[PDB]
Amino acid sequence: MNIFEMLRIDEGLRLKIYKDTEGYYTIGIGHLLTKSPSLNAAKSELDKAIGRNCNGVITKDEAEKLFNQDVDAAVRGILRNAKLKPVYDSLDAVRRCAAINMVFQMGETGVAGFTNSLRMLQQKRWDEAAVNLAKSRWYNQTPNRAKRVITTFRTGTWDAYK
Ligand SMILES: Cc1ccccc1C
Numbered sequence: 001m002n003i004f005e006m007l008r009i010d011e012g013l014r015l016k017i018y019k020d021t022e023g024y025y026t027i028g029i030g031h032l033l034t035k036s037p038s039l040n041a042a043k044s045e046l047d048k049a050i051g052r053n054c055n056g057v058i059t060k061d062e063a064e065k066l067f068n069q070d071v072d073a074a075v076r077g078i079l080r081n082a083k084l085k086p087v088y089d090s091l092d093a094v095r096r097c098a099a100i101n102m103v104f105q106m107g108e109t110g111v112a113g114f115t116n117s118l119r120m121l122q123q124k125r126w127d128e129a130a131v132n133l134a135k136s137r138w139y140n141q142t143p144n145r146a147k148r149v150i151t152t153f154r155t156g157t158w159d160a161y162k
């Protein structure tokens with residue numbers, strides 16, 4: 001297992017514009033297009049991202065390239081952020097994947113509310129961090145996804161994905 005396989009399981013793959021759990025236009029392996037309610041705005045963002053007139057549909061190769069870019073961007077966001085980088089660097093490779101997963105789903109700004117969880121993770125207080133992570137809108141709105149990610153932080157294994 002690696003971060004790409006983990007996120008492919010959590011996000012799925014769809015080659016036509018769809019709506020995510022919050023109702024936002026998305027395509028591919030969880031690539032957010034726009035938060036605007038306008039399908040035309042989403043189609044424009046898609047064409048800009050792919051570099052051709054897609055009319056709302058992409059190929060598997062295009063979805064996989066967008067996905068590589070999106071994972072890269074999540075990692076770079078962590079490494080540039082003075083609050084997140086020290087916690088990330090303290091983690092083992094499996095737990096680092098759980099961290100990237102959260103940033104991919106919620107962004108840097110969405111993880112800003114997790115300051116207390118981050119401190120517990122940096123201190124390697126895994127059970128305590130798991131409880132704190134679950135006291136969140138994230139866990140209540142996407143509980144199965146959150147349980148898999150939290151279990152990865154708690155155990156440092158891939159057991160939730162196996
Ligand atoms: C979201 C995030 C980022 C970096 C380290 C740990 C965590 C939970």
Ligand SMILES: [Cl-]
Pocket residue numbers: 141142143144145146
């Ligand atoms: Cl879920």
